[PDB]
Amino acid sequence: LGTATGFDFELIDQAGLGHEKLTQARNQLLAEAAKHPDMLTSVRPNGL
Amino acid sequence: EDTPQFKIDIDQEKAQALGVSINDINTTLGAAWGGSYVNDFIDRGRVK
């Protein structure tokens, strides 16, 4: 199973953008989820 | 209903005398007139 008080999120490129266009969308989302410390903690990517 | 169709009649004695094989007579006939699937490529990240 997973965990309680914890989510599991996907980030799909549904327009054929690429891998370097998806990493820049991935880093934009994480750097924006780090400025909400009172709502979101321990946000990270799962891959490499 | 049964249509006219164009029978082409390869001679393999007369081809052997000229130096061609039927491993590229039938390919030149088949890939030009019918079309040949060679391999795959990548088109915006999709195998086509």
Swiss-Prot record, chain A:
Homotrimer, with large domains that extend into the periplasm, interacts with AcrA and TolC. AcrA may be required to stably link this protein and TolC. Interacts with AcrZ. Part of the AcrA-AcrB-AcrZ-TolC efflux pump. The gene is acrB. Signal peptide: none annotated. Belongs to the resistance-nodulation-cell division (RND) (TC 2.A.6) family. It comes from Escherichia coli (strain K12). It is found in: Cell inner membrane. AcrA-AcrB-AcrZ-TolC is a drug efflux protein complex with broad substrate specificity that uses the proton motive force to export substrates. (Microbial infection) Involved in contact-dependent growth inhibition (CDI), acts downstream of BamA, the receptor for CDI. Its role in CDI is independent of the AcrA-AcrB-TolC efflux pump complex. The chain holds residues 674 to 721 of 1049 of the full protein. This is Multidrug efflux pump subunit AcrB. Induction: Positively regulated by MarA, Rob and SoxS transcriptional regulators (at protein level). Disruption phenotype: Loss of susceptibility to contact-dependent growth inhibition (CDI); inhibiting cells still contact the target.
